[PDB]
Amino acid sequence: KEVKVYSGRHYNTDKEVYQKFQEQTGIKVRYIETDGKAIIERLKREGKNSQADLVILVDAAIIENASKANLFQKINSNFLENSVPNNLRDPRNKWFGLTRRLRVIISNPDIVDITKIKNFEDLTNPSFKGKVCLRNRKSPYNQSLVSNQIAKKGVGQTKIWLKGLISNVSTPYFSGDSSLIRAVGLGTCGIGIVNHYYVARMLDGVKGPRDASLAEKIKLIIPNPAHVNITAGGVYKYAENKTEAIKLLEYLASSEGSQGLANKTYEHPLKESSQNRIVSKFGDFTPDNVTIKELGKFNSKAIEIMKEVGWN
Ligand SMILES: [Fe+3]
């Protein structure tokens, strides 16, 4: 018996978690790890001829792309329905959350007054003029953040916040979260918005000594309440090994499985905050209760309003 996993968790960190499932169950895990959008495009092309059993994807926006494209089948599981929090799964049971990431504020306290920064709304302060730096609108992470704001405040109010935010940007858009962390730490940027786990990875020397030194210069602010995003798993629509795909998903969503995946990328497990000493130092967070499904709903409108105010 075997199971074929196509995973968009492209961090090169998760192989060990699949090995523990194999040893306990005797089910062979064939594992492909690449870009999420390459997986979606390949699967649309293959249809019934695909060898995918279980699909793992990063971000609300990519999960919505896969759902729109009809890539998942509904599954029934007492374990999953009674263990994965409602806000972090498909109401129609086609996909399930496995890890939690926060998109946070990073600041250089030698360049800006950090006592003035608590939440996203503060980044429109005119005293931050020229000092705010962003990754481009092509990042699903950024699209899902603007989608978060539309969910709570509606389109009108979100556009006001975006006109204010983009006003304070005077630097070209970055193509990644790690290069924006380097700019904030070097001090060419005073304020950035990035995923918390990139700061943890650089602090722990994963990207070498220079990136570690730059990351020490940064003060990380968790908005209160906090915007939460996820990685998720679902069973492929035409999975051959359906039974084995459900067993592996039940394992990855469990306390052992969710801690295993999360501890590799410095994320939070599903039902508890990270044990990790670097992540714990960032502080406690309270979720804002916007569902992952809602983040997918408002993705199209988020892209249109980012384009309209000039977030490029
Ligand atoms: Fe990432």
Side-chain angles (χ1 to χ4, degrees), residues 1-263 265-312:
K1 289 182 294 179
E2 68 176 8
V3 63
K4 291 211 177 74
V5 177
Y6 290 37
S7 175
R9 273 175 60 81
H10 197 195
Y11 295 106
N12 206 72
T13 56
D14 300 343
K15 180 198 163 142
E16 278 181 36
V17 177
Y18 299 113
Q19 288 215 225
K20 294 166 90 87
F21 171 81
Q22 186 171 302
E23 270 161 42
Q24 294 160 2
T25 64
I27 302 165
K28 297 201 154 183
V29 181
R30 293 185 182 173
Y31 176 60
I32 289 193
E33 186 185 295
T34 188
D35 172 63
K37 297 180 173 187
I39 290 157
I40 292 164
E41 290 302 315
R42 185 188 176 160
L43 295 201
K44 289 192 300 198
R45 171 163 178 77
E46 280 169 359
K48 295 152 143 66
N49 298 129
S50 190
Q51 296 178 20
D53 295 318
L54 186 79
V55 185
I56 293 169
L57 295 173
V58 181
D59 200 272
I62 306 303
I63 290 165
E64 168 75 17
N65 284 343
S67 291
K68 278 287 145 200
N70 215 36
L71 286 199
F72 297 123
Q73 56 172 295
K74 185 177 296 276
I75 64 157
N76 288 333
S77 175
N78 288 314
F79 181 73
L80 291 174
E81 280 160 43
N82 294 303
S83 294
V84 173
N86 278 80
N87 288 352
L88 307 179
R89 67 194 180 70
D90 188 25
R92 291 172 168 155
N93 278 6
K94 289 173 178 201
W95 56 259
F96 299 87
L98 300 171
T99 73
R100 294 188 292 165
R101 59 264 307 284
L102 313 179
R103 201 148 188 81
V104 292
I105 300 156
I106 57 165
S107 61
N108 187 319
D110 291 319
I111 307 303
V112 295
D113 183 0
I114 62 160
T115 63
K116 309 273 182 223
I117 306 174
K118 300 304 160 198
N119 54 44
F120 288 123
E121 293 84 12
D122 292 322
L123 298 183
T124 68
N125 190 312
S127 57
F128 303 140
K129 194 72 159 47
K131 309 202 172 184
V132 178
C133 293
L134 298 175
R135 169 169 196 182
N136 59 36
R137 85 149 175 279
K138 286 166 197 293
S139 178
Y141 302 155
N142 287 329
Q143 289 164 20
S144 288
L145 176 64
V146 175
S147 279
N148 175 258
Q149 296 295 310
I150 297 163
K152 304 196 272 179
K153 300 173 164 197
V155 182
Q157 268 280 286
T158 299
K159 279 156 156 233
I160 304 324
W161 168 70
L162 282 175
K163 281 222 153 56
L165 178 67
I166 302 311
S167 294
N168 282 341
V169 183
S170 292
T171 303
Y173 292 95
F174 291 76
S175 49
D177 275 27
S178 284
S179 52
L180 173 53
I181 296 165
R182 288 197 278 260
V184 174
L186 189 57
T188 62
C189 294
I191 299 163
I193 307 181
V194 294
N195 287 346
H196 85 269
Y197 61 87
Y198 295 116
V199 184
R201 280 175 87 71
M202 286 173 71
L203 274 173
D204 211 21
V206 169
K207 294 193 75 84
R210 172 159 192 267
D211 281 7
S213 282
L214 290 178
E216 298 211 327
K217 306 299 308 180
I218 283 164
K219 180 46 179 246
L220 188 146
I221 305 167
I222 302 181
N224 170 291
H227 162 58
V228 178
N229 213 323
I230 67 165
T231 79
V235 180
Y236 185 55
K237 189 174 202 319
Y238 304 112
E240 179 96 325
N241 303 118
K242 190 173 147 168
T243 294
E244 294 88 352
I246 293 168
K247 297 200 172 176
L248 177 53
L249 192 50
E250 283 173 341
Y251 176 67
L252 294 174
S254 79
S255 291
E256 192 182 308
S258 187
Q259 282 180 351
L261 288 178
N263 287 341
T265 56
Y266 297 85
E267 295 178 75
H268 299 284
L270 213 58
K271 298 210 82 133
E272 303 184 65
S273 62
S274 184
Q275 294 318 79
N276 186 279
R277 289 291 181 111
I278 295 158
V279 175
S280 68
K281 279 175 175 143
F282 294 160
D284 305 305
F285 64 95
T286 303
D288 64 2
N289 281 327
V290 177
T291 64
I292 303 297
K293 187 71 190 172
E294 284 176 299
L295 293 188
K297 204 199 320 193
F298 293 124
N299 180 80
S300 278
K301 199 56 148 178
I303 291 171
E304 165 180 291
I305 60 171
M306 290 157 103
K307 177 156 166 188
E308 163 175 331
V309 302
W311 189 335
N312 301 318

